[PDB]
Ligand SMILES: O=C1C[C@H](O)[C@H](Cc2ccccc2)NC(=O)CCCCCCCCCCCCCNC(=O)[C@H](Cc2cccnc2)N1
Ligand SMILES: *[C@@H]1O[C@H](CO)[C@@H](O[C@@H]2O[C@H](CO)[C@@H](O)[C@H](O)[C@H]2NC(C)=O)[C@H](O)[C@H]1NC(C)=O
């Protein structure tokens with residue numbers, strides 16, 4: 001079988017969310033569809049955080065199939081953390097069900113982690129980085145032979161650069177579970193193989209990057225000759241090591257680091273009227289990033305300068321990834337996340 005999750009685009013390409021249904025009878029939530037993590041969670045109806053008061057929450061008491069545990073749920077993300085307890089219940093998404101899905105019932109987060117219309121997150125990466133230790137929903141489906149083809153196809157629609165776009169765009173793209181949508185891509189899928197040691201994040205090596213015509217040194221002390229890149233639908237921008245960000249922005253005339261005193265340390269800005277030509281090379285092919293994705297607009301009162309989509313963030317040496325390649329990149333390609341043989345594919349959008 002195949003099934004489709006319709007994506008809502010929240011925050012002008014900040015996050016892409018889909019409907020999950022939990023419990024008996026079904027409680028529905030809009031959850032971030034996140035290829036950079038592996039846990040399902042939803043805000044619990046007992047949560048007293050302000051954000052929980054202003055969005056849909058999961059009432060464990062009205063699900064006849066909910067199995068409670070005292071087991072702590074604690075997950076850290078780049079953007080902060082979520083805590084509560086594990087539970088088990090029937091979960092449905094894209095017309096599939098996992099009857100005994102373990103997931104987090106969240107009752108506290110760091111400030112501003114999520115808000116209306118979101119209620120939580122669905123991890124689409126591999127069981128080995130699940131904080132819960134539970135098999136991810138998608139991975140159970142792929143492993144059970146429920147899919148026509150053992151892959152997920154991803155199309156993220158672009159609203160950045162649309163001056164009349166809303167903060168909530170229900171026409172936000174599509175995830176196809178169990179195949180690729182041939183109406184949304186053109187030509188052949190370029191698959192980059194993932195070996196059995198790399199099944200954690202969804203990640204592949206970066207071969208090269210060209211900005212304003214110049215091939216950037218993508219060597220790093222953390223990632224050696226070539227960085228391993230998380231291909232992460234749950235990240236807005238593109239996070240690279242500090243030395244790499246300095247080298248990228250050195251290729252754009254007039255580019256500068258935003259100061260610590262701006263509040264935007266890690267970000268860089270460059271002349272607004274410079275259209276940046278930039279590509280990333282994966283599996284022997286150059287994939288361009290459109291100017292509408294690269295240029296985030298003016299962060300300061302200096303309206304002649306605009307922030308770029310590449311930001312500096314040094315990673316723990318415990319991390320197997322040195323880059324986080326988010327939606328800023330992914331919006332430019334149709335993406336195949338392939339379970340077996342494990343791979344990430346890219347195709348030109350239709
Ligand atoms: O955060 C992420 C990336 C993810 O797409 C989130 C999703 C999100 C977005 C909006 C709200 C909540 C969750 N994305 C983000 O957090 C968006 C900002 C990302 C900034 C760039 C990523 C830097 C992350 C590295 C340090 C974090 C610690 C490890 N944490 C991670 O790597 C975890 C997964 C994980 C691994 C191992 C154990 N536990 C959880 N994934
Ligand atoms: C593949 O993508 C196409 C294009 O987005 C989807 O086509 C839509 O499907 C619905 C009903 O299935 C139609 O009512 C819409 O008019 C279609 N939209 C367009 C723009 O063509 C298609 O459903 C997707 N296929 C799968 C299997 O997910």
Ligand SMILES: [Cl-]
Pocket residue numbers: 210211213277278279286288
């Ligand atoms: Cl280029």
Ligand code: NA
Pocket residue numbers: 223224225226227228
């Ligand atoms: Na490396």
